[PDB]
Amino acid sequence: VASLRQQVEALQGQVQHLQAAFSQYKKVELFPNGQSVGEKIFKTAGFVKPFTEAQLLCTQAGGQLASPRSAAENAALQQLVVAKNEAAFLSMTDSKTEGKFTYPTGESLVYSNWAPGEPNDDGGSEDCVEIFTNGKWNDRACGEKRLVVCEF
């Protein structure tokens, strides 16, 4: 029992160092292309791509396209869009049923920040969503190229 008690104390020291070092590296990592909000992390690839390609990049990376579910998350996302000065794609679309936007899971939206008059399915062909530098949303053609931002 003496040895065990001694080992445990040793582990505490190792863990304290890791937590401290990790805390520092998290800040370093997020600068300047990431944003942490709650338990979510948004990170931009810094370039533009059409929706399908953007979606694949995020999913293959173990995440998904930016999916702001609250005003706080939307503002965090807006910071990256503003930094790059490029509107970005969100993960949501109404490709399945026109007029009904859903997350990749199929769940209906729990938050939205549509610009006045949007979504309007302009030209009868806008199933994707973009977020502007002002944080507002607009449905847009999925074939258009927008800033790639994933969430993890």
Place this chain on the structure above:
Amino acid sequence: ADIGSDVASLRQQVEALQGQVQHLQAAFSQYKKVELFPNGQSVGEKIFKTAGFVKPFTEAQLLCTQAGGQLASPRSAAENAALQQLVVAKNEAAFLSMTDSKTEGKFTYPTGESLVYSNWAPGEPNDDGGSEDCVEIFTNGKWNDRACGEKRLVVCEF
């Protein structure tokens, strides 16, 4: 019921936990190297990281502060050399955190404390044009006071 068995069970758990920590330590060390390549430099307990682009002092300062750090503030020859590596790699002079905006001729850190280290280029600081309150570090590592409105490489320290 058997104290010996209870101790053995705890031993088993401690061994497993110890394994987890050893694995994490090795994985974290590798990740640190990956993170620092190619825009970061670690010196002592400080880490310098560049954003890869230029901005005027005010915007550069806000970027670093909002990221939870501050503009590069080399406090020794060792830290200066580390920062210089990034400046050289990007071939772009960078802003430091220090200014003499409060009292002309007296440079201080964001906290207000006076410099504990300096590496001024010959003849600097010279407050050229009577309007240079910020500081830039050249690819040769030397410092020069510069107009804060000018754009220089953004490098933060964490």
Place this chain on the structure above:
Amino acid sequence: GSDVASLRQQVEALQGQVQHLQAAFSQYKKVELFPNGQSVGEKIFKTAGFVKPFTEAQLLCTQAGGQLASPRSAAENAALQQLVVAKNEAAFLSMTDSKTEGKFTYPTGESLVYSNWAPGEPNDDGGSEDCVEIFTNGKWNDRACGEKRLVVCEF
């Protein structure tokens, strides 16, 4: 008796913190790799995003604590190919035949244990191609070390 019990709850608590750290670390690891890195096995490839001549690229990787990309299998080669395709730029590998023409080796001097030469390669075209580049199609080509190619290191 009571000691083992107190040590128990102490271990239980510490394990909780480690697993929380493990969870946070796993998340930041994914974030780190997006979009300039690729993990394969215990190896991690990461591109600097810019091109450089061989010597300069090699120094960058070594000074960073790693080495130039050195795919030792089809799986590692495929992972590396992803970064090349994503950046749409051929990249230098670590291997060269600078010591003995026609014989490519890793920085340690060991002979290749895997290769993926494109048709007709290596051909030492021009009479001086001692470095190696990987194309977007994953195939290899010996290239003049003085040429500039995408910098990709492995850690």
